[PDB]
Design an enzyme around this catalytic site. Structure first.
Site, PDB file in Angstrom:
ATOM      1  N   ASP A  74      20.479   4.810  -3.544  1.00  0.00           N
ATOM      2  CA  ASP A  74      21.856   5.217  -3.208  1.00  0.00           C
ATOM      3  C   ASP A  74      22.337   4.509  -1.940  1.00  0.00           C
ATOM      4  OD1 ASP A  74      24.285   6.425  -3.759  1.00  0.00           O
ATOM      5  OD2 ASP A  74      23.726   8.374  -2.940  1.00  0.00           O
ATOM      6  N   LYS A 115      21.466  19.964   7.010  1.00  0.00           N
ATOM      7  CA  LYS A 115      21.965  19.691   5.659  1.00  0.00           C
ATOM      8  C   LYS A 115      21.560  20.874   4.776  1.00  0.00           C
ATOM      9  CE  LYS A 115      21.561  16.103   1.998  1.00  0.00           C
ATOM     10  NZ  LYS A 115      20.737  14.949   1.565  1.00  0.00           N
TER      11      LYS A 115
HETATM   12  N1  ADP Z   1      21.895  12.426  10.472  1.00  0.00           N
HETATM   13  C1  ADP Z   1      23.206  12.495  10.381  1.00  0.00           C
HETATM   14  N2  ADP Z   1      24.000  12.263  11.419  1.00  0.00           N
HETATM   15  C2  ADP Z   1      25.317  12.326  11.319  1.00  0.00           C
HETATM   16  N3  ADP Z   1      25.940  12.619  10.207  1.00  0.00           N
HETATM   17  C3  ADP Z   1      25.280  12.870   9.085  1.00  0.00           C
HETATM   18  C4  ADP Z   1      23.828  12.814   9.113  1.00  0.00           C
HETATM   19  N4  ADP Z   1      23.386  13.089   7.905  1.00  0.00           N
HETATM   20  C5  ADP Z   1      24.467  13.309   7.174  1.00  0.00           C
HETATM   21  N5  ADP Z   1      25.605  13.189   7.853  1.00  0.00           N
HETATM   22  C6  ADP Z   1      26.965  13.347   7.302  1.00  0.00           C
HETATM   23  O1  ADP Z   1      26.953  14.188   6.159  1.00  0.00           O
HETATM   24  C7  ADP Z   1      27.231  13.462   4.965  1.00  0.00           C
HETATM   25  C8  ADP Z   1      26.375  13.878   3.766  1.00  0.00           C
HETATM   26  O2  ADP Z   1      24.983  13.764   3.963  1.00  0.00           O
HETATM   27  P1  ADP Z   1      23.962  13.287   2.870  1.00  0.00           P
HETATM   28  O3  ADP Z   1      22.565  13.417   3.306  1.00  0.00           O
HETATM   29  O4  ADP Z   1      24.353  11.955   2.859  1.00  0.00           O
HETATM   30  O5  ADP Z   1      24.416  14.323   1.734  1.00  0.00           O
HETATM   31  P2  ADP Z   1      24.652  14.208   0.160  1.00  0.00           P
HETATM   32  O6  ADP Z   1      23.375  13.788  -0.460  1.00  0.00           O
HETATM   33  O7  ADP Z   1      25.095  15.556  -0.187  1.00  0.00           O
HETATM   34  O8  ADP Z   1      25.699  13.225  -0.033  1.00  0.00           O
HETATM   35  C9  ADP Z   1      27.057  12.015   5.351  1.00  0.00           C
HETATM   36  O9  ADP Z   1      27.773  11.098   4.533  1.00  0.00           O
HETATM   37  C10 ADP Z   1      27.475  12.018   6.806  1.00  0.00           C
HETATM   38  O10 ADP Z   1      28.871  11.941   6.968  1.00  0.00           O
HETATM   39 MG    MG Z   2      25.504  10.776   0.830  1.00  0.00          MG
END
Ligand code: ADP
Ligand code: MG
Ligand code: IHP
EC number: 2.7.11.1
Length: 327
Positions: A155, A67
């Site tokens: 959230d 991320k």
């Molecule tokens: N551990 C993970 N495994 C698979 N997909 C993930 C994971 N973490 C995030 N994602 C994908 O990336 C997206 C955004 O991550 P997130 O941490 O939720 O970011 P933000 O805070 O920018 O929304 C998620 O909604 C998901 O689709």
């Molecule tokens: Mg998110």
């Protein structure tokens, strides 16, 4: 004399009795590793706050998720890291595996365990009555745990719950809005995603707590058992409270506002109207009746309450008859 104070009915003083090292995220020292150990494979998502990628850890040939964080306040990055480090290893909490920076960009990146997720827009339609009970209990294990650790997720929504349905594996992700609970603290109400915002956020009641997550969980449960996504479909933050009041009614809304001496924003004057409380049974239809039961409706009723203090805690929810059939 202003709004009436409030505090969490459970885990109220967990941070008070802990040393500042635990919750003082601003003073936490982050050690950023070398991102060269991770090879990016593909984009997995994006978000208001990041670009997420599927990657390979080149040292063990294991799939991970990287991320890469969007330009926001470094204070917010430190908070998310500290909370993830505090909760690391907790039940159904996404595991932060590493904290890295690419050598040339120096962009902060968080490395997580990979979850082979099925998007909720494709998955929720295929879930059985048992599966909804099972996955709701898995989220409750995560929430009871993070609340016991003095943390509010703030959230909770389908996009932040990763489910590997084939392995019946669930992880609560996206701790970027999460905060430490300190009794009496006045928090920013501009958190959570519109459809999942608790009435406390919508009426600008700042002294909220872990119970905000239980309202969000109730919104997810309602959308799953009734096959109505989202359940409360507001077009803006004020209209979101009107969608809620069209179901829970306006009488109990005014009782909530009065118990806490909240002043309703004038923007509510022309849009709130008068609404009777609708019985939960009115949302049952031929397409969803196989997911609804008296236990499901009783449990939903105890989560979706205007009064944040009246809602079930995650531990009380785990003891509900709706979960007797789960492991
Ligand atoms: N551990 C993970 N495994 C698979 N997909 C993930 C994971 N973490 C995030 N994602 C994908 O990336 C997206 C955004 O991550 P997130 O941490 O939720 O970011 P933000 O805070 O920018 O929304 C998620 O909604 C998901 O689709
Ligand atoms: Mg998110
Ligand atoms: O599927 P659509 O015909 O596009 O309508 C749906 C849906 O129900 P209908 O299918 O029966 O219209 C919602 O409302 P109800 O009809 O269930 O009451 C509706 O509206 P609300 O959520 O505002 O009630 C919603 O959203 P909107 O019209 O707000 O966009 C909209 O869904 P889509 O947006 O996904 O088309």
């Amino acid at each position: 004399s202003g709004p009436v104070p409030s505090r969490a009915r459970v885990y109220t003083d967990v941070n008070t009795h802990r040393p500042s090292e635990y919750w003082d995220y601003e003073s936490h020292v982050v050690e950023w590793g070398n991102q060269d150990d991770y090879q990016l494979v593909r984009k997995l998502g994006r978000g208001k706050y990041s670009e997420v990628f599927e990657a390979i850890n080149i040292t063990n040939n294991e799939k991970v998720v990287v991320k890469i964080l969007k330009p926001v306040k470094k204070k917010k990055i430190k908070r998310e890291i500290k909370i993830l480090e505090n909760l690391r290893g907790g039940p159904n909490i996404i595991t932060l595996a590493d904290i890295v920076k690419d050598p040339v960009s120096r962009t902060p990146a968080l490395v997580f365990e990979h979850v082979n997720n099925t998007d909720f827009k494709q998955l929720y339609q295929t879930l059985t009555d048992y599966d909804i009970r099972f996955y709701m209990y898995e989220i409750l294990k995560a929430l009871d745990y993070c609340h016991s650790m003095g943390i509010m997720h703030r959230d909770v929504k389908p996009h932040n719950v990763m489910i590997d349905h084939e392995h019946r594996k669930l992880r609560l992700i996206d701790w970027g809005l999460a905060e430490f609970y300190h009794p009496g603290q006045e928090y920013n109400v501009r958190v959570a995603s519109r459809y999942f915002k608790g009435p406390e956020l919508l009426v600008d009641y700042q002294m909220y707590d872990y119970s905000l997550d239980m309202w969000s969980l109730g919104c997810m449960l309602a959308s799953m058992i009734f096959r109505k996504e989202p359940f409360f479909h507001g077009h803006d933050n004020y209209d979101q409270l009107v969608r809620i009041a069209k179901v829970l009614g306006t009488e109990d809304l005014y009782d909530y506002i009065d118990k806490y001496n909240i002043e309703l924003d004038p923007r509510f004057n022309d849009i709130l109207g008068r609404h009777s409380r609708k019985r939960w049974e009115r949302f049952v239809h031929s397409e969803n009746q196989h997911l609804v039961s008296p236990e499901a409706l009783d449990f939903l009723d105890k989560l979706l309450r205007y009064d944040h203090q009246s809602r079930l805690t995650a531990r009380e929810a785990m003891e509900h008859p709706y979960f007797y059939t789960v492991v």
